[PDB]
């Protein structure tokens, strides 16, 4: 079956610049291909049709471009509501087919996250687990490093993180660290405290609190 | 106008089957083709096959002509399709999709369908507030934890709370269970801050208040 | 070993009936007289009537030869009594009781119907928590309101802690709910603070954990 | 049919006092008396059978006195767990007929009552409706005074009391004042006090918060 391959799987590119998405076929597709964009909720529109043709609603920065086995959608400017993943499809043959997708990042201007930590809820002691939780707010870029100290000593291997997908009205992500101690151990310390590298901040920042 | 509503999630024994709901509405069914494609987890997009409403008739991708089968009532606007002895290849996103004919294209999408396949039972979450303790940006959230499968929403006051808010991707733990947590950044009369979850799954909707205690002695 | 258990309670429409029951063991039934009594809100006792179980046989207190009316399944060991069209009257905490023979006497009394009788349709309680802001002695509660009808149950850590607590009388608001408050004292690990509410009448249960927020930046 | 009277509904007595509870017929009963204690909570024990005679488990400062239409029940030491409403009943003819009932107090050394104020919950600022709650905890005798100032302004016919049954292990009262009010008017005053005055008070007792 024919093969489409969008061999960059991950682009990224500054408000304003032109970007440029591409799409090989194994073989001639006869510019029966159609492009569609992939928000992070998961929803997926429509964007071109039959190579260089706008559905309605797109906005007139996107082209649709190309012939034979090689296709390009390019976004003239570039604004922060184009985060998605773009993928290609033909109906040349049966069967449809897709390529794998492209990823795009928006970049912008570096800002610091807002750093909140929040102590385990009573309500959770019961469990036997406590979860003392550290959150970053709209930062970029989104390589951060978060410490978990307890009394002072650091942590390890007692933490998982997770991190949004790039927000699309600011270009910014958040992050969400979660130590994870038993009940036992949380109430054999009185300071919490994570502490934020990134880019943005001249030194770190801990944010703690002091139980009891 | 147009519109797909698709079956909530599915948990599913590995080795049952599952028949997904595309309720449409907006155009007269009968005038356009429903296709459906899958989406396994690393996000690469498979059509799966086509049916035409006005007759029944199909085109099945050869990659599901064992697994998947489709149909429509006519009637309730409302194609199915069914996956038979399900592996673990199953778990993936299933969307329907409308085609449109200018030539063709896919013009309309589902929201999309989570299905696990796993014999691990469900569990609904346990839902805690998130608050701080000591500018004019404070933080709440609350934190959903110890569920399966994955697909949990998260709401702010009923919908009315958009702004500030980011609900977080889930963590696979160590016991097999997920969890997640929600945040909403706020300005600083004391308005409240309800978390609303839905883990469909297992039938649990909690509903809960984020206490901000701001009194003094 | 000797026990009365009594149907929870009873909203009524008035107009209704109503079918008490009094499940019993730890004695062989047969053997004992049962006897029924009304207490109406001023706490005043009246007689109701009494049951034979091994033969079936009656004698009703002629204030109630209408309203009331006693049966019993030999089998299940559990006596029961209908009350027929209810009025306002007829709301009551109804024991059933046991007959012992030394003379004559009631030896082991249930622990009470709450009936009532009324249009007003149910309602569920909202619950609470009470924290206070700021000795070895600190005091957390949760409030209980807006519900109907009468009778409540608060627990604390599912029947764990008894020392320290006082659930407070119910009031009547002005909207025709009731509305109530249940207090702990304690010493100052942290363990948790739980509130258990059953509201039999509208099949509510809440358990509310109640959150002293101790922690500062 | 035969009415019982027990003339005296309230009776209360000091912790080692005698105490007698009176019982009268319409008419001859031939001592076909019995006499039942009821505690708080509901529950209803037998405590004298046949004007005399002892329930198993009934300690023996319970004493049954009494024949034709005249019968007492004392308790010789007073105890703490006597707390009860304790009724008669004959069996002589049916109807069984039972005593009005007799609710007994305990007399104890005055205690003042621990005071605590208890702001609404944001959960409940949703309904529209706020609820400040005040508790005077473990007081003796049950007389208390309870005035809510808001803003150091005394309010007046917004507020509802609830006062416990009398403890069975320290003679004491717990109370329960629950002032109300709109969101609207919790949120346009600061200070919320209670203002207890109890004769075991030398002078009265505020407890406040400050909302914000």
């Known amino acids: 079956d024919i093969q489409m391959t969008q061999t960059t799987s991950s682009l990224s590119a500054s408000l304003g610049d032109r970007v440029t998405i591409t799409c090989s076929a194994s073989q001639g597709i006869n510019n029966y291909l159609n492009w569609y964009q992939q928000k992070p909720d998961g929803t997926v529109k429509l964007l071109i049709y039959y190579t260089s043709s706008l559905h309605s609603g797109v906005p007139s920065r996107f082209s649709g471009s190309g012939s034979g086995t090689d296709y390009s959608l390019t976004i003239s400017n570039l604004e922060p509501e184009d985060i998605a993943t773009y993928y290609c499809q033909q109906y040349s043959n049966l069967p449809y087919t897709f390529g794998g997708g492209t990823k795009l990042e928006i970049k912008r201007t570096v800002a610091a996250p807002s750093v909140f930590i929040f102590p385990p809820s009573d309500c959770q002691l019961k469990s036997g687990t406590a979860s003392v939780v550290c959150l970053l707010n709209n930062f970029y870029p989104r390589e951060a490093k978060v410490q978990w100290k307890v009394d002072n000593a650091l942590q390890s291997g007692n933490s998982q993180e997770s991190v949004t997908e790039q927000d699309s009205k600011d270009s910014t992500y958040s992050l969400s660290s979660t130590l994870t101690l038993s009940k036992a151990d949380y109430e054999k310390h009185k300071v919490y405290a994570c502490e934020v590298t990134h880019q943005g901040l001249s030194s770190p920042v801990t944010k703690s609190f002091n139980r009891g | 106008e147009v519109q797909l509503q698709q079956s909530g999630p599915d948990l599913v024994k590995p080795g049952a089957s599952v028949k997904i709901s595309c309720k449409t509405s907006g155009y007269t069914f009968t005038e356009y083709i429903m296709h459906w494609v899958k989406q396994s987890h690393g996000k690469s997009l498979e059509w799966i096959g086509g049916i035409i409403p006005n007759n029944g008739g199909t085109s099945y991708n050869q990659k599901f002509k064992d697994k998947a089968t489709m149909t429509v009532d006519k009637s309730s606007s409302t194609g199915y399709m069914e996956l038979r002895s399900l592996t673990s290849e199953d778990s993936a996103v299933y969307y329907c999709?409308?085609?449109?004919?200018?030539?063709?294209?896919?013009?309309?999408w589902g929201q999309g369908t989570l299905v696990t396949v796993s014999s691990a039972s469900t569990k609904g979450p346990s839902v805690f507030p998130l608050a701080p303790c000591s500018e004019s940006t404070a933080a709440l959230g609350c934190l959903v934890k110890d569920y399966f499968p994955e697909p949990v929403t998260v709401s702010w006051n009923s919908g009315a709370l958009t702004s500030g808010v980011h609900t977080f991707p889930a963590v696979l733990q160590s016991s097999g269970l997920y969890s997640l947590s929600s945040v909403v950044t706020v300005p600083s009369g004391t308005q409240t801050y309800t978390c609303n979850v839905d883990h469909k799954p297992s039938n649990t909707k909690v509903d809960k208040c984020v206490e901000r205690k701001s009194c003094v002695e | 070993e000797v026990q009365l258990q009594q149907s929870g309670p009873d909203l009524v429409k008035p107009g209704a009936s109503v079918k008490i029951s009094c499940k019993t063991s730890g004695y062989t039934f047969t053997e004992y007289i049962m006897h029924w009594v009304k207490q109406s809100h001023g706490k005043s006792l009246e007689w109701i009537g009494g049951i034979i179980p091994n033969n079936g046989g009656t004698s009703y207190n002629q204030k109630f030869k209408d309203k009331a009316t006693m049966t019993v399944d030999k089998s299940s060991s559990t006596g029961y009594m209908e009350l027929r069209s209810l009025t306002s009257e007829d709301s009551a905490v109804?024991?059933?009781?046991?007959?012992?023979?030394?003379?004559?006497?009631?030896?082991?009394?249930?622990?009470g119907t709450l009936v009532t009788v009324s249009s007003a349709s149910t309602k569920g309680p909202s619950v609470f928590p009470l924290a206070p802001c700021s000795e070895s002695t600190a005091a957390l509660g949760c409030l209980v309101k807006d519900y109907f009808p009468e009778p409540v149950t608060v627990s604390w850590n599912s029947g764990a802690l008894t020392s320290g607590v006082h659930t407070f009388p119910a009031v009547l608001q002005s909207s025709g709910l009731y509305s109530l408050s249940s207090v702990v004292t304690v010493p100052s690990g942290t363990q948790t603070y739980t509130c258990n509410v059953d509201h039999k009448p509208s099949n509510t249960k809440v358990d509310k954990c109640v959150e002293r927020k101790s922690c500062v930046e | 049919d035969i009415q019982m009277t027990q003339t005296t509904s309230s009776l209360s007595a000091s912790l080692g006092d005698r105490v007698t509870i009176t019982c009268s017929a319409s008419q001859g009963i031939n001592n076909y008396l019995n006499w039942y204690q009821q505690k708080p909570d509901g529950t209803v024990k037998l405590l004298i059978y046949y004007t005399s005679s002892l329930h198993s488990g009934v300690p023996s400062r319970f004493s049954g006195s009494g024949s034709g239409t005249d019968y007492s029940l004392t308790i010789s030491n007073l105890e703490p767990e006597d707390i009860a409403t304790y009724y008669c009943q004959q069996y002589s003819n049916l109807p069984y007929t039972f005593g009005g009932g007799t609710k007994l107090e305990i007399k104890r050394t005055v205690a003042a009552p621990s005071v605590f104020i208890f702001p609404p919950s944001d959960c409940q600022l949703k309904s529209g409706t706020a609820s400040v709650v005040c508790l005077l905890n473990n007081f003796y005798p049950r007389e208390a005074k309870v005035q809510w100032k808001v803003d150091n302004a005394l309010q007046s016919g917004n507020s509802q009391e609830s006062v416990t049954e009398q403890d069975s292990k320290d003679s004491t009262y717990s109370l329960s004042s629950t002032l109300t009010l709109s969101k609207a008017d919790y949120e346009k005053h600061k200070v919320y006090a209670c203002e207890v005055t109890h004769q075991g008070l030398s002078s009265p007792v505020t407890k406040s918060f400050n909302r914000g």
């Open positions: 999709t409308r085609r449109e004919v200018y030539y063709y294209a896919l013009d309309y």
